[PDB]
Amino acid sequence: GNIFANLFKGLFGKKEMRILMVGLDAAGKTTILYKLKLGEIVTTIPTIGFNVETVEYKNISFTVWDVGGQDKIRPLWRHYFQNTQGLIFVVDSNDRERVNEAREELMRMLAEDELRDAVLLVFANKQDLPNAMNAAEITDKLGLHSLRHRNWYIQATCATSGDGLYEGLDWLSNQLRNQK
Amino acid sequence: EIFELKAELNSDKKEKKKEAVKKVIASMTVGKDVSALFPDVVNCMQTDNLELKKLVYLYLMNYAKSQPDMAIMAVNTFVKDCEDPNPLIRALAVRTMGCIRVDKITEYLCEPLRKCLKDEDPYVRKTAAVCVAKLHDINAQLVEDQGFLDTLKDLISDSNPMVVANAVAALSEIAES
Amino acid sequence: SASAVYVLDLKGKVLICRNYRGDVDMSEVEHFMPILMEKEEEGMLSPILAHGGVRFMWIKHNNLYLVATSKKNACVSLVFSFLYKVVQVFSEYFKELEEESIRDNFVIIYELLDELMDFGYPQTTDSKILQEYITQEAPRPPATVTNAVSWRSEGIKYRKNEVFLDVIEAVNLLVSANGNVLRSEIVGSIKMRVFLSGMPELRLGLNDKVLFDNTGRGKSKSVELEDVKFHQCVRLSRFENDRTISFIPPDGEFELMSYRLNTHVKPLIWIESVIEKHSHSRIEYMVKAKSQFKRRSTANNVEIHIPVPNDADSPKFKTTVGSVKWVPENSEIVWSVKSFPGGKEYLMRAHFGLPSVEAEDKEGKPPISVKFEIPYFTTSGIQVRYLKIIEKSGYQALPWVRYITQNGDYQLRTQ
Amino acid sequence: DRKGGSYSQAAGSDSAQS
Ligand SMILES: Nc1nc2c(ncn2[C@@H]2O[C@H](COP(=O)(O)OP(=O)(O)OP(=O)(O)O)[C@@H](O)[C@H]2O)c(=O)[nH]1
Ligand SMILES: [Mg+2]
């Protein structure tokens, strides 16, 4: 066999990568996905089902599958976990009551044998008000440091401002892609 | 067979997805119970190709009563497709929304029905009138609550004479029942 | 108001089905075949079936039964019209109407069925409009369907504006066994194959008796059609107002007007049959054909079918003009003539034996029918006056029309 | 030529009717 075509394709960029869009409802997951794909904060209707979109950055097409945080859509995240390589969790630092629910949902998602090769992607959503926690308080509350055998990274991103999305994308690419 | 079809439908290749959809459609027409693969095709539903969208909508309509629980993962897709710029896509979405015999599906489709009621396209107007008539036949109380009788009555005295005739037929069918 | 229209097969298998309302279960199609079989074996079979509280109306297609199951008291005429429109659309899209094309164009067939009707109410019925939005090899719906003019697509451009008309005449004569004609009706057919640039509005004008009387010229030969049906593009308002046949011609072959009135003239071909059938010994076929049409008109491909005995064998033909061939499948002898000039007298003398054992049951006396077709003949005498072809851009059209005279229900009752 | 009657040219209207 010959891999000349594969080498030629990889010389100019062949890797694409994957990503997931999960989190509690009203946690900026849809806004984060829109900012990653388009770059603007557009108001959208509640995600009754799911949102499918692709984002190309650094020569890698990291497709993001938006998943709602509704009760009827929370158990449907397992359907989108199949044929998925990445997962991004959007935390609601401004929702103290919903913080526990988001942490429980993240623990349930990470406590599945099928979702084991996907590194943790915790995004501190709603990072625009004083009530939002920092990149360490949210992780400590969610117990991201205790996720053994999982590469979890806590990043603070504001949907209105869009800051930190580039850093999170770069961290995800570094975790997934291990090439020069 | 079934496993191979599921693997093909769960892939990122457009040609393979189209081949899997065609095989599923042929099996369904030949007399094969393809309702078990409906949840697998739910993920492969939001597709840019119009041929695959029509097949997915037909499978959902034919697999809606069989798997009402699995039909809850298509409300977002229907809402997204109801605002498609192409009039054919909007008409197909309106027809599929009214063709789905789901009690909880038509409740979330009231907003799309109201949005498509004032559609400027005569084909879009006819599709909205047909969807309103189907919703009224399935749920007269839901149609009355949505206030589609006033929209249907006003469609008769508008342009789009084919759309006016469709609205008049829908109003007569509602009054007939 | 059929619940779901489906296409069956000769073996009872549904080639394709598409529910429109969902009020009728799809399993009722299986019981349709046993009901049809029971009706056929008892003589109670009808196109509109009835399975309990749901009626399964079916139409005998070329190879499959177009069963359109219905639940409530829907419009039977509307259901029949929808089935006819679907059959016409399938014939236009697929040149073959059988199981070969039913399972070969399922991807486009399902889309066409979905677009044709929704919730039991048909929406799209134009073959050109359907082909312009749904193809087997999708853009937005055409504006022609939304616009008032749904029978003339705008923007059509052609190198030449040539329209080919066809004055089709059907001569039907119901001659009883006593020798008298009972049903003698001639149905006209004005079909034009318009192929031009744009959407011209045809201005049909002929030597109509009503128009001649209205204009004061009711003294020449004028055709007085008892029943005149205009095409879809023909405006009925102009015809009711002053008999003005003004409408947009369609793109292709279409039927503009179809006259239908009784005929009080002598038959074009006078055929007298003699049955010198012996009692299980021999049979005599004293068939004489007299051409009652004008000598200037020749009946091309004249085939006077004379029903021979069902069990007759070893037949001998003794005729003068026209070859006589006995087809065992048809159980009759047809006096086929390539050219039949008007006034020609053809005499034939059939002679064949019969089996010694008599038949167990009677076979009946089917009427004798001829297949005479003399073109360039106007038996009704109606002559087209003018065809007002007007276009906004402005062009010189060269319409053409041909008059064809043939034999329709020209059946003569057997003795 | 063509069977069933040769095609003939048709006018535009009745010139004798004004
Ligand atoms: N205005 C504003 N909203 C923010 C901000 N950060 C997070 N959000 C949330 O992001 C949400 C945007 O809604 P969506 O587009 O539907 O995305 P989502 O948060 O995942 O909501 P669902 O799709 O229903 O799950 C808003 O409801 C906010 O609660 C912010 O900085 N400003
Ligand atoms: Mg969202």
mmCIF file of C-alpha atoms in Angstrom, chain A:
data_model
loop_
_atom_site.group_PDB
_atom_site.id
_atom_site.type_symbol
_atom_site.label_atom_id
_atom_site.label_comp_id
_atom_site.label_asym_id
_atom_site.label_seq_id
_atom_site.Cartn_x
_atom_site.Cartn_y
_atom_site.Cartn_z
ATOM 1 C CA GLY A 1 0.000 0.000 0.000
ATOM 2 C CA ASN A 2 0.912 3.648 -0.553
ATOM 3 C CA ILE A 3 0.067 6.665 1.599
ATOM 4 C CA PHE A 4 1.319 9.351 -0.785
ATOM 5 C CA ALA A 5 -2.191 10.768 -1.225
ATOM 6 C CA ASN A 6 -2.703 10.884 2.548
ATOM 7 C CA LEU A 7 0.619 12.686 3.027
ATOM 8 C CA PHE A 8 -0.248 15.184 0.284
ATOM 9 C CA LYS A 9 -3.649 15.837 1.872
ATOM 10 C CA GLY A 10 -2.120 16.273 5.332
ATOM 11 C CA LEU A 11 0.624 18.597 4.087
ATOM 12 C CA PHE A 12 -1.939 21.347 3.400
ATOM 13 C CA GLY A 13 -4.339 20.377 6.202
ATOM 14 C CA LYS A 14 -6.515 17.271 6.413
ATOM 15 C CA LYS A 15 -7.448 16.968 10.088
ATOM 16 C CA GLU A 16 -10.937 18.211 10.967
ATOM 17 C CA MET A 17 -11.707 17.242 14.578
ATOM 18 C CA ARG A 18 -15.098 17.196 16.319
ATOM 19 C CA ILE A 19 -16.949 19.011 19.104
ATOM 20 C CA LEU A 20 -20.183 18.792 21.094
ATOM 21 C CA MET A 21 -22.615 21.406 22.416
ATOM 22 C CA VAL A 22 -24.095 20.351 25.768
ATOM 23 C CA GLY A 23 -25.152 22.137 28.922
ATOM 24 C CA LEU A 24 -28.080 23.469 30.884
ATOM 25 C CA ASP A 25 -30.827 25.466 29.202
ATOM 26 C CA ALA A 26 -30.188 29.208 28.905
ATOM 27 C CA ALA A 27 -26.491 28.540 29.586
ATOM 28 C CA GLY A 28 -25.214 30.184 26.397
ATOM 29 C CA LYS A 29 -24.660 26.906 24.541
ATOM 30 C CA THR A 30 -26.600 28.085 21.483
ATOM 31 C CA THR A 31 -25.052 31.552 21.784
ATOM 32 C CA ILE A 32 -21.588 30.002 22.134
ATOM 33 C CA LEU A 33 -22.173 27.847 19.047
ATOM 34 C CA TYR A 34 -23.404 30.861 17.065
ATOM 35 C CA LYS A 35 -20.349 32.878 18.115
ATOM 36 C CA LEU A 36 -18.051 30.002 17.136
ATOM 37 C CA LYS A 37 -19.731 29.593 13.739
ATOM 38 C CA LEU A 38 -20.876 33.136 12.884
ATOM 39 C CA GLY A 39 -19.482 35.466 15.552
ATOM 40 C CA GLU A 40 -22.558 37.363 16.771
ATOM 41 C CA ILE A 41 -24.957 37.044 19.701
ATOM 42 C CA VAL A 42 -28.300 36.258 18.037
ATOM 43 C CA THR A 43 -31.381 35.430 20.106
ATOM 44 C CA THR A 44 -32.834 32.023 19.233
ATOM 45 C CA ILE A 45 -35.906 30.022 20.233
ATOM 46 C CA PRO A 46 -35.451 27.280 22.864
ATOM 47 C CA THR A 47 -33.684 24.189 21.551
ATOM 48 C CA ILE A 48 -36.524 21.662 21.648
ATOM 49 C CA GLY A 49 -34.475 19.253 19.541
ATOM 50 C CA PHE A 50 -30.860 19.855 18.554
ATOM 51 C CA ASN A 51 -28.752 22.198 16.433
ATOM 52 C CA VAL A 52 -26.257 20.890 13.866
ATOM 53 C CA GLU A 53 -23.486 23.164 12.592
ATOM 54 C CA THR A 54 -19.810 23.089 11.637
ATOM 55 C CA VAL A 55 -17.001 25.512 12.482
ATOM 56 C CA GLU A 56 -13.679 25.556 10.609
ATOM 57 C CA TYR A 57 -10.689 26.986 12.476
ATOM 58 C CA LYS A 58 -6.942 26.386 12.097
ATOM 59 C CA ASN A 59 -7.621 24.173 9.050
ATOM 60 C CA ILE A 60 -9.788 21.879 11.220
ATOM 61 C CA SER A 61 -13.572 21.682 10.791
ATOM 62 C CA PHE A 62 -14.749 21.245 14.388
ATOM 63 C CA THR A 63 -18.456 20.513 13.970
ATOM 64 C CA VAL A 64 -20.603 21.423 16.987
ATOM 65 C CA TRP A 65 -23.879 19.619 17.737
ATOM 66 C CA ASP A 66 -26.016 21.847 19.952
ATOM 67 C CA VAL A 67 -27.973 19.988 22.641
ATOM 68 C CA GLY A 68 -30.690 21.592 24.734
ATOM 69 C CA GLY A 69 -30.785 21.608 28.508
ATOM 70 C CA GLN A 70 -34.494 20.864 28.717
ATOM 71 C CA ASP A 71 -35.790 17.919 30.728
ATOM 72 C CA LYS A 72 -37.219 16.305 27.587
ATOM 73 C CA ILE A 73 -33.906 16.951 25.785
ATOM 74 C CA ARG A 74 -31.513 16.158 28.653
ATOM 75 C CA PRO A 75 -31.817 12.356 28.194
ATOM 76 C CA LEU A 76 -31.490 12.845 24.417
ATOM 77 C CA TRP A 77 -27.811 13.817 24.750
ATOM 78 C CA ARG A 78 -26.900 10.122 24.503
ATOM 79 C CA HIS A 79 -28.215 10.033 20.926
ATOM 80 C CA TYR A 80 -25.782 12.799 19.940
ATOM 81 C CA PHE A 81 -22.941 11.113 21.857
ATOM 82 C CA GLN A 82 -22.688 8.468 19.113
ATOM 83 C CA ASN A 83 -20.206 9.318 16.346
ATOM 84 C CA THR A 84 -18.992 12.283 18.412
ATOM 85 C CA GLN A 85 -15.343 12.991 19.223
ATOM 86 C CA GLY A 86 -15.616 16.153 21.337
ATOM 87 C CA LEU A 87 -17.953 17.665 23.898
ATOM 88 C CA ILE A 88 -18.192 21.252 25.159
ATOM 89 C CA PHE A 89 -20.122 21.933 28.369
ATOM 90 C CA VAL A 90 -21.485 25.439 28.981
ATOM 91 C CA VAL A 91 -21.865 26.254 32.676
ATOM 92 C CA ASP A 92 -24.280 28.848 34.076
ATOM 93 C CA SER A 93 -22.248 30.798 36.633
ATOM 94 C CA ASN A 94 -25.131 33.264 37.090
ATOM 95 C CA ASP A 95 -27.582 30.450 37.973
ATOM 96 C CA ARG A 96 -26.574 29.241 41.434
ATOM 97 C CA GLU A 97 -29.694 27.068 41.687
ATOM 98 C CA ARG A 98 -29.043 25.614 38.220
ATOM 99 C CA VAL A 99 -25.306 25.248 38.925
ATOM 100 C CA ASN A 100 -25.954 22.030 40.855
ATOM 101 C CA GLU A 101 -28.162 20.719 38.040
ATOM 102 C CA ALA A 102 -25.490 21.520 35.444
ATOM 103 C CA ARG A 103 -22.827 19.814 37.568
ATOM 104 C CA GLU A 104 -25.029 16.732 37.972
ATOM 105 C CA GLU A 105 -25.695 16.614 34.223
ATOM 106 C CA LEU A 106 -21.972 16.923 33.478
ATOM 107 C CA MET A 107 -21.173 14.161 35.979
ATOM 108 C CA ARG A 108 -23.825 11.906 34.432
ATOM 109 C CA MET A 109 -22.474 12.579 30.934
ATOM 110 C CA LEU A 110 -18.883 11.906 32.035
ATOM 111 C CA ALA A 111 -19.923 8.794 34.011
ATOM 112 C CA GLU A 112 -20.695 6.824 30.826
ATOM 113 C CA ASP A 113 -18.286 4.271 29.369
ATOM 114 C CA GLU A 114 -19.197 5.343 25.824
ATOM 115 C CA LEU A 115 -18.151 8.957 26.522
ATOM 116 C CA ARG A 116 -14.598 8.268 27.697
ATOM 117 C CA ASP A 117 -12.284 9.407 24.885
ATOM 118 C CA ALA A 118 -13.872 12.885 24.785
ATOM 119 C CA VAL A 119 -11.971 15.404 26.900
ATOM 120 C CA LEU A 120 -13.863 17.702 29.246
ATOM 121 C CA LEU A 121 -14.694 21.111 27.759
ATOM 122 C CA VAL A 122 -16.124 23.342 30.499
ATOM 123 C CA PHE A 123 -17.040 26.852 29.343
ATOM 124 C CA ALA A 124 -17.905 29.448 31.995
ATOM 125 C CA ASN A 125 -20.979 30.864 30.281
ATOM 126 C CA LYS A 126 -22.618 34.100 31.439
ATOM 127 C CA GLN A 127 -19.176 35.544 32.235
ATOM 128 C CA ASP A 128 -20.378 39.132 31.887
ATOM 129 C CA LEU A 129 -22.038 39.889 35.254
ATOM 130 C CA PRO A 130 -20.426 40.219 38.700
ATOM 131 C CA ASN A 131 -22.344 37.140 39.892
ATOM 132 C CA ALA A 132 -20.454 34.906 37.442
ATOM 133 C CA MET A 133 -17.736 32.798 39.046
ATOM 134 C CA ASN A 134 -14.099 32.663 37.948
ATOM 135 C CA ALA A 135 -12.323 29.908 36.009
ATOM 136 C CA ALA A 136 -11.430 28.098 39.262
ATOM 137 C CA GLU A 137 -14.501 28.557 41.477
ATOM 138 C CA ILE A 138 -16.805 27.116 38.804
ATOM 139 C CA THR A 139 -14.454 24.179 38.200
ATOM 140 C CA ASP A 140 -14.138 23.564 41.946
ATOM 141 C CA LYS A 141 -17.924 23.600 42.369
ATOM 142 C CA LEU A 142 -18.371 21.265 39.388
ATOM 143 C CA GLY A 143 -15.495 19.047 40.545
ATOM 144 C CA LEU A 144 -13.594 19.234 37.262
ATOM 145 C CA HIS A 145 -10.307 18.524 39.067
ATOM 146 C CA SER A 146 -11.646 15.127 40.214
ATOM 147 C CA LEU A 147 -12.466 13.928 36.669
ATOM 148 C CA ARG A 148 -9.721 11.312 36.461
ATOM 149 C CA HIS A 149 -8.775 10.059 32.988
ATOM 150 C CA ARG A 150 -10.475 13.132 31.492
ATOM 151 C CA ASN A 151 -8.810 16.259 30.083
ATOM 152 C CA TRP A 152 -11.083 18.966 31.494
ATOM 153 C CA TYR A 153 -10.310 22.655 30.995
ATOM 154 C CA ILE A 154 -12.244 25.520 32.586
ATOM 155 C CA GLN A 155 -12.546 28.659 30.450
ATOM 156 C CA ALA A 156 -14.625 31.788 31.048
ATOM 157 C CA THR A 157 -16.473 33.082 27.980
ATOM 158 C CA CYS A 158 -19.051 35.871 27.749
ATOM 159 C CA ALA A 159 -21.732 35.414 25.093
ATOM 160 C CA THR A 160 -22.226 39.169 24.678
ATOM 161 C CA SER A 161 -18.488 39.922 24.486
ATOM 162 C CA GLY A 162 -17.215 36.721 22.862
ATOM 163 C CA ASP A 163 -13.890 36.834 24.712
ATOM 164 C CA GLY A 164 -12.312 33.501 25.592
ATOM 165 C CA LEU A 165 -13.885 31.564 22.716
ATOM 166 C CA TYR A 166 -10.606 31.658 20.778
ATOM 167 C CA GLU A 167 -8.675 30.441 23.828
ATOM 168 C CA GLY A 168 -11.156 27.614 24.369
ATOM 169 C CA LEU A 169 -10.982 26.588 20.714
ATOM 170 C CA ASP A 170 -7.174 26.619 20.843
ATOM 171 C CA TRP A 171 -7.191 24.517 24.021
ATOM 172 C CA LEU A 172 -9.598 22.024 22.438
ATOM 173 C CA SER A 173 -7.437 21.820 19.306
ATOM 174 C CA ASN A 174 -4.305 21.261 21.401
ATOM 175 C CA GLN A 175 -6.046 18.543 23.426
ATOM 176 C CA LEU A 176 -7.345 16.806 20.292
ATOM 177 C CA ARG A 177 -4.590 17.546 17.757
ATOM 178 C CA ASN A 178 -1.081 16.528 18.854
ATOM 179 C CA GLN A 179 0.831 17.581 15.726
ATOM 180 C CA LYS A 180 3.067 20.511 14.810
#
